[PDB]
């Protein structure tokens, strides 16, 4: 309807989904559809991905085939978020405007709301944000690093 | 706090005080004093009028005025100042919290127990009063149920026979004569030696004079020879500017006007006689003891010798085997108060006092159904 | 709970205002706002809030912004200073123990570690706050409240140069409260020095002046019968007291001449006058002239004269015309008041001086600026209140009129910038019963000005009699004369009642007209001026003797000198700090409701909440609004293209606000009830669950790429 | 500023100050002298007194001279105080049984030619207790013209018992002037008037008991004191010290019929009220420059003593700056806060007319 | 005349002198004794230690004057009995020793100044007989009633003497001292407000006759003062005995309204109106309507225009609107105690009243007190 997937596109896709299906069955476990899709660099929500997944597990064998995974590609490829959106998202959550955000208020924001990150997650964020070691994140350049 | 009030609103002393007290708690002169001349110092605080001490104190800048003659208040809009001077300055109480139980005398006028009655309770928001008479008062303050009271204030000498607790009211005889004529009087016989005294702060040097001076001649035409024959009856008064006064048989002829009304040119009895008329005027059954308990109450009974004289003239007056007896107490200047501060604590009297209640629901009327 | 009291629902409630007290400071938030008020309740502990990470937090933004914290107020009030550059005050307010001494401290704390010089900074810190034990000994008192009352006004200045470094301070002292001086209420004690130095002076020292330990030998020690008592350690305080003097720079026989002033007035008060045939006084005891003649430096043939004789000069003739014993007594004490204030003054100059800049600070010197702090006495009621309290509630009457004159005049101001029309806020208006206490010809001061004047036997009772007859039907003054049967059972004779913004306050006027005649005579002036003794020969000064006019009464001095105050305070920039003693056990955690809920009284914060509210709890330029509440309205989000009045425009539809619950200014957005306000803050705390969820996604669609491929 | 200005016209000196002083700032001679400028007015007129003829405007208490009166005015004003009197109330003074006139036209001078906001007339001997601190006494005020006795009993006048006497400072200089011939000195010009004034004022005194003094006078020169006149010859005085001051206590050396102080005292005391008196005994109040005589109250105090009953105690209050009480206390009354709904004001002249006085004052 | 009785009314401002059975008084003079003030200067003159009555009036310009009664009281008796002296002597030409003495006084006097004329007329002038007849009760006789109030003013005494049917009510007499030396004191105080200043007792004099001439009594006190305040038609003027014009206005009411409005010269007293009215409400029965209206007015201060229909007004206001108040003021009243002092002494029935020289002898001057 409002977007339609060029035919290159969807070989770029299906090769990038080829090391995810790996023997050659065409199909993705339902707790992987979000890794195939974030290895294409895709923004996915674990909400949206519950979403997508309640209309495809309609009968069971814990997987979904190539046809629905590209479907729910360009379900997600219509509206996707930008560089200026997660920017100005840090920018709501900087207490001074300043550009500067402290990484234990970070690891608040990251797990005390909603969509949690798990300690790996975090950990491993937390390692790179504290960019020169003073404790506090430059949340701007942060994005783009993170929009690469 | 609901003690009970009680005021003798005498004609020439306001007496106060509580029930249950001893003796009043506020005596002063019954006067409102009014300047008389031209204010000149200016932020001095001076007043439209004084009441009391306050115009006793001032009298040389002041005209001034009794509300009460002849025991009937003339001047209401005054005696208003009186009372309320009463129980704000002296007594120092709210009048809305104490039934007030006031005195007049006797063959009074209606109005003037009427118009006392709506003041208490229009005026001063009192939750009860009561109008007793004065003489009656006077028998409470002698613990005697019988006896025939001579009351004599500064404006009605009257005599009230009671036997037992009744009184016999056709036989209470009233003399409008007492020691504000006695006053005035005095100020007469004073110029005959060139004393002047004429204005009324001058009338209270002259009350004084009565007060300190005068007594009663246990025969006044043998006085009269005393004094004619001798300086031994002269005694000197110093007054308030230092002028030594001296008067000699003027302090027997003032006192004798009781005795000899004429005096003041009045057709009326003497003291004597009108107590005597007024035992004759009982049953004869009661006489006997009504003599031997003439009880003698008021300032104008206070005195030397009257006790001694008007026994004197009753024993020639009332038969040869009768024992006439005459009780002057010391304290005889209060009995009225006493016997007031008596009839207000007994609780068979409580029953008594006039509540605003009764006085909404009847009026002003209601004094002559409850006293 | 809220932090700016504005922002409470039920504004109009006292228990509403006292239970948000409450809540924060069982919370340990001790600080709240009122709009740019600071309120703070006495924690009675040493909480870390003052520490360097808190002067570095605070310092760069402004009372708008950060949460409440007097360095919020500190930050404010400095950086005024720097960029308006007109010179500021801020007013430390409250009860004695209420913190104002720990604020003062903090203050000057900040000041000196958060400024670009802090080695003078910190000199004129120190220099400031060493100056307290001598200020306390000569200027605070035990009251029937406290046992350490302030009994003056109190100023510290700060004074800064172009480059917002501190180049020197001052020190001023206002309305010192020296009826105290030579008479006591019941339970209250003179000015601590004298009690210090009976019970802790050497033996030398009180022997070369009068000599007696026993504060009972003296009348003026004695009045309020309560010179013992086991709260205060005057032998210790001594020794902390007299060391202040020597760490301030006064030399030892500049310490000897201000002893034998505080001795000189211990002997003043013990003289004692008989009548001559003539009733004109004389001095019956040689033994206080055998010493005041050495202490105070004077011939005692003029002093014996000075104080018994008042001087006229006409056509170049001098009359000595003598004083009856009413007079005498009313110059004796009047010579204390002054010897022992005009030496209070003279202390405070010679620290004053020390605090003074050491570089020239004058032309072609570029430019300076003083930032302040004055800390004042507080409302005051006790179970009897008399002349002193009169003056001190007075003081913050006019101190309130105004504080509420400025806040309305502020709030009125800014509706008018913004175009909004003036919603009316209807306040109680102090200047009805300021002019109840100061109109020139109608007020009570006036009143007892006449009294103390007019001719005759004028009595206390005289006083109250004309003040019955003269000020009579107003709404703010009763007396038992005038009060009705129910209100006469609360109030006594010898009373009057003045209806204050802190509530209604009942004065017995006996020693009104003892405690305002001030007869201060030319004569006693012109023996002083004449002494020997280095103080008092600074204290009065020959150009005095110029003055014509009778001495004017204390109540009129107070008049003049609060109304010098006033003036001064509407020519600075003030701000304000509002102090709660939170129980008077000085006990951390207890909050005592019933005497917070007298201290929010006196304090006029009820008041300040209403006329500070007005129209709209809330306004913010829709520059700032716009940037905290976009991420709502997605029309505007992550960036508007239009302007922010358009932007705020379409998302307040988008939030769903209704027509009469905000406003649209010239710049900033208003918003009627805080309702709206907490309603979208809710809104954009569900809201960031949508902002994490995003960073969420974006860290996984890059940490995946990171760790795998 | 716009304080109350006060000044006690007196027959002889102009004081004059403001309501809030300690003493009157302008206290000049109530003259002025013209050539033999056009004219010259208060100390001028006495520096200059040789060439001049020396006139006083006011004799008795009444202003006799109006064209005179508002020289003296104006040079109070605009030289001494130096003052617009259009900005300030203004409190004036007078005698107490003054014609009506006088007040009158002293009002109509105020509010027509020195435009005066508001004014009053206070009585002198009233203005003589405030500057007392008294509400009770009675007051001997003696100035250069008139002598006059008001009682006050708690700040109520007895305006029948106040008692006036024309004979004061002015009639015992030209009572001195003449008996001065008899040792061989004549005064005669206005100018000569002036220096028996200053010989007045430093060599008289009131005899305790004058036949005594005069005895003594007669025996030896112990009384004789010495005085220079202003071209440097000398006078001496003996008897003359006290027959001068005498003529207070007897009138009849002026040719008068009058009682003396003494008596005139006793007679307002004794035309009050009997309970007045031993207060106003104890409250003899002196004022003005005519009571300042070293020897006058102990002598008013043996007088009255003398004419009072042995009980009463006789007290006279002659305070050092006797001289100025009138205006010390027209200080203190302009001052009061109660006496500001007391002025008559311009509105109230410009419906009532100059006839406002006697409902005001 | 050889045999007839004396009259003499020593009132406090003229003696009034004659013998009884003439319709007036043969000498009418002041009541004064003056002395000079001066030194004489031409030792070659018959000057006297003292002047009396019209002798020391034409020198008074030199006397000090002084009147020997005050207030109805002798209080200086050597000056009285030089005034006596001269009445006798130098005025009617009589011995007294021959002729029996009818004096008068005021009612509520000290009973000394009685005692002191009868010890001076049986000392001193020798007189055969004499008598003290009380002031007002003599002007009933001139008036030819039996009853009516009397109000007398003289010099120094108003008084008020209710007589019903020949009895006087000695309670209801009423005495106020305040009459004509009090309204010239007050005249003397008054003209100060216009600068005219009379202070000597020669000056007392020559206002004494203004008041004499120029005063009268307003009927409605307050009308006219604002016909006074209003218009010049008040106004009247008097040549002074020095050729200086006095002019005087409301002065001329004011000074006698002290009459109806004794607070004007600070006394505490009700006026003459009232002291009438409440004479009256001191008496009897049927005899308040009989006074009210035979209301008698008596002496000097009397003599003022409209005082009868002041009196009248001011009396009718007090008492009843059915009294019939008549106030009974003839022409002659200024000399109604002496005239009804003739009468009186020459009265068949009267000539036992005297106190004879006998009766002075058996009991001292206390005699006064037993016979009048
Ligand atoms: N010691 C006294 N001797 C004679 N009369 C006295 C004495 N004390 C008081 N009085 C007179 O008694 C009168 C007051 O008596 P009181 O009974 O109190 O009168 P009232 O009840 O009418 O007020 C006054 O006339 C007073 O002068
Ligand atoms: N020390 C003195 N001794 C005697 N007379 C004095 C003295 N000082 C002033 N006087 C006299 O006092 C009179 C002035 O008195 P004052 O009160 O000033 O009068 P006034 O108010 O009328 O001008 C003059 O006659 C003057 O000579
Ligand atoms: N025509 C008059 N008008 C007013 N007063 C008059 C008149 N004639 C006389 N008098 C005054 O009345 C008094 C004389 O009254 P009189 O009875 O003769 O006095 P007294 O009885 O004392 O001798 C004097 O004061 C006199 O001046
Ligand atoms: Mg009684
Ligand atoms: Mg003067
Ligand atoms: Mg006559």
Known sequence: MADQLTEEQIAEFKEAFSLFDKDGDGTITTKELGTVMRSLGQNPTEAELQDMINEVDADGNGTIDFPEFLTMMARKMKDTDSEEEIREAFRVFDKDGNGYISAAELRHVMTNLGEKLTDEEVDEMIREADIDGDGQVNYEEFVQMMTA | ETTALVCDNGSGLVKAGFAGDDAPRAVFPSIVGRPRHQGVMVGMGQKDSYVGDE??????????????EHGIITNWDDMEKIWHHTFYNELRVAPEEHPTLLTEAPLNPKANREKMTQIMFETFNVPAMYVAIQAVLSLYASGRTTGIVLDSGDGVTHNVPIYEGYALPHAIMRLDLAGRDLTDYLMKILTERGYSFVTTAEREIVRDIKEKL????????????????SSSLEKSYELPDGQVITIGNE???????????????????????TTYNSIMKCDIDIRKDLYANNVMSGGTTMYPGIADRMQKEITALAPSTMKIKIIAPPERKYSVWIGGSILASLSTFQQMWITKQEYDEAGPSIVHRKC | GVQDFVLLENFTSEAAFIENLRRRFRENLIYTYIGPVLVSVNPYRDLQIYSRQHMERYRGVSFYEVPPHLFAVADTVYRALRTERRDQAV????????????????????????????????????????????????????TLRNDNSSRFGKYMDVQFDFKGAPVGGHILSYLLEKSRVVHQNHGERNFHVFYQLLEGGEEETLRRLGLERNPQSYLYLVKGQCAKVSSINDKSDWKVMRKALSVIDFTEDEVEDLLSIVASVLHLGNIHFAADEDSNAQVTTENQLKYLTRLLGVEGTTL????????????????????????????????????????????????????????????????????????????????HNSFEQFCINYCNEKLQQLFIELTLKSEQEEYEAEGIAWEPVQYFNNKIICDLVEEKFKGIISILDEECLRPGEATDLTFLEKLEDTVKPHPHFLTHKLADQKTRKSLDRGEFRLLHYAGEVTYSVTGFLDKNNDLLFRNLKETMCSSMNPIMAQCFDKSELSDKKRPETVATQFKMSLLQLVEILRSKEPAYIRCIKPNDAKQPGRFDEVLIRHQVKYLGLMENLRVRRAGFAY????????????????????????????????????????????????????????????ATEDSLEVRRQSLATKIQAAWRGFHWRQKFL
């Open chain 2, 55 to 68: 115009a006793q104190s001032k009298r040389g800048i002041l005209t001034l005025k009794y509300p009460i």
């Open chain 2, 214 to 229: 005068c007594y009663v001649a246990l025969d006044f035409e043998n006085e009269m020879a005393t004094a004619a024959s």
């Open chain 2, 251 to 273: 302090r027997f002829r003032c006192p004798e006007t009781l005795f000899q009304p004429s005096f003041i040119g009045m057709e009326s009895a003497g003291i004597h006689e």
């Open chain 3, 91 to 142: 007013m430390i307010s409250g009860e004695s123990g209420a913190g104002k001494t720990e604020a003062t401290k903090r203050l000057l704390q900040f000041y000196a570690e958060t400024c670009p010089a802090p080695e003078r900074g910190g000199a004129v810190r120190d220099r400031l706050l060493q100056s307290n034990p001598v200020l306390e000994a000569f200027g605070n008192a035990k």
């Open chain 3, 304 to 383: 014996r004269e000075a104080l018994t004789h008042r001087k006229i000069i006409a056509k170049g003739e001098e009359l000595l015309s003598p004083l009856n014993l009413e007079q005498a007594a009313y110059a004796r004490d009047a010579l204390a008041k002054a010897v022992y204030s005009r030496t209070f003054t003279w202390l405070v100059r010679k620290i004053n001086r020390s605090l003074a800049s050491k570089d020239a600070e004058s032309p072609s010197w570029r430019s300076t600026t003083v930032l302040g702090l004055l800390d004042i006495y507080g409302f005051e009621v006790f179970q």
């Open chain 3, 619 to 678: 306004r913010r330029k829709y520059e700032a609004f716009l940037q905290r509440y976009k991420s709502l309205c997605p029309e505007t989000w992550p960036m508007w293209a239009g302007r922010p009045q358009d932007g705020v425009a379409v998302l307040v539809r988008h939030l769903g606000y209704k027509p009469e619950e905000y406003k649209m200014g010239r710049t900033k957005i208003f918003i009627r009830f805080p309702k709206t306000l907490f």
